[PDB]
C-alpha cells in the first residue's frame, strides 16, 4: 500500500539557486534505454557531430 511518484527537489529546498531542472528530465530519462558507457560516449559524439 504505497504510491511511487517523482518529487521535485524544488518542493523540498526553499533555495532556488541550486535547482536547475524538474521532474521532466526524470521522465525523459525513463524514456531512455539503459546505456553502456560506450553508448553514452556514442551519444555525445553524435550530438557533437
Amino acid at each position: 500500500r504505497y504510491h511511487e511518484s517523482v518529487l521535485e527537489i524544488a518542493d523540498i529546498f526553499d533555495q532556488a539557486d541550486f535547482i536547475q531542472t524538474s521532474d521532466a528530465v526524470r521522465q525523459l530519462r525513463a524514456l531512455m534505454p539503459t546505456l553502456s558507457t560506450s553508448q553514452i560516449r556514442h551519444a555525445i559524439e553524435r550530438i557533437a557531430q
Binding site: 534505454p33 539503459t34 553502456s36 560506450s38 553508448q39
Partner: protein, 50 residues
C-alpha cells in the same frame, strides 16, 4: 589411453590468454524480456550455444 594422454597434454599446455573479441551491446528494447534478464550489457558476437 594414448588419446587421454594427448588430451591431458594439450590441456597442460593450453597457454591461451583471452582478449575481448568482437562484442555487441544491443539496445535493451529490441530484446525479448527473457533474453534481457539473461544478458548483461555486452556479449560476444560469437555467442556459443546454451
Amino acid at each position: 589411453v594414448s588419446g587421454l594422454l594427448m588430451v591431458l597434454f594439450k590441456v597442460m599446455t593450453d597457454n591461451r590468454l583471452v582478449i575481448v573479441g568482437e562484442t555487441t551491446t544491443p539496445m535493451s528494447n529490441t530484446l525479448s524480456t527473457v533474453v534481457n534478464n539473461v544478458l548483461r550489457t555486452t556479449y560476444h558476437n560469437n555467442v556459443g550455444v546454451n
